[PDB]
């Protein structure tokens, strides 16, 4: 998970 | 600038996220977005024009921000859907299994269902925790757009979620996406906001  | 929910905006003329959504303060005008976008005081520029500067944001525990802008923007009740777009009527939380969508700057709009709510996303920076999840695709750039229903009620702004090599999860199967968003309530509760509605 990545910020988009 | 017209402000509409998933419209292109910059952070300092470097970074690029999208409007979540319109809203006032007493005589301030606003939107909320992703508070990974900004640092409180950076300016937010439309079309190469300012239009305000973050008044606050939390990031991370919560991905959360409001931009205040200057008089001169309109604000607008709707979300854009390629030319089109839907209005803004409340913000009623929809529950899981509800069909939602999104807009934002990188993959237009996009629709899909909540799969899970208080879902922890583990970024580089710290967690966020309290997002819920949806399916409906994105790609870098998407942040700080709406998430919205059909029947126009505000669930909250894109955070992240599982983007691939491409800079989306648009190529791989709805039922492995995992795309997440901050809750609008609590935005709207902590800052005192209200939503612009149509």
């Known amino acids: 998970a990545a910020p988009i | 600038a017209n402000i509409v929910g998933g419209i292109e905006y910059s952070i300092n003329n470097a970074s690029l996220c999208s409007v979540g959504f319109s809203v006032t303060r007493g005589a301030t005008k606003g939107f909320?977005?992703?508070?990974?976008?900004?640092?409180?005081?950076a300016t937010a520029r439309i079309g190469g024009a300012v239009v305000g500067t973050f008044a606050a944001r939390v990031f991370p525990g919560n991905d959360r921000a409001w931009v205040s802008l200057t008089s001169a923007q309109t604000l607008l009740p709707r979300v854009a859907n390629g030319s089109s777009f839907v209005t803004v009527r409340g913000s009623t939380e929809a529950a899981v299994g509800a069909a939602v969508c999104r807009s934002g700057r990188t993959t237009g709009y996009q629709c899909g269902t909540i799969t899970?709510?208080?879902?922890?996303?583990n970024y580089a920076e710290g967690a966020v925790?309290?997002?819920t999840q949806g399916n409906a695709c994105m790609g870098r750039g998407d942040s700080g757009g709406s998430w919205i229903t059909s029947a126009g009620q505000a669930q909250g702004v894109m955070s992240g979620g599982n983007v691939q090599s491409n800079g989306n999860n648009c190529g791989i199967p709805a039922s492995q996406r995992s795309s997440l968003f901050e809750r609008l309530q609590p935005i709207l509760s902590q800052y005192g906001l209200s939503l612009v509605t149509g």
Do not use: M, P, S
Request: aromatic share 0%; with cysteine; hydrophobic share 35%.
């Open chain 2, 32 to 41: 909320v977005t992703a508070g990974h976008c900004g640092t409180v005081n």
């Open chain 2, 129 to 131: 925790r309290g997002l």
């Open chain 2, 116 to 121: 899970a709510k208080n879902v922890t996303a």
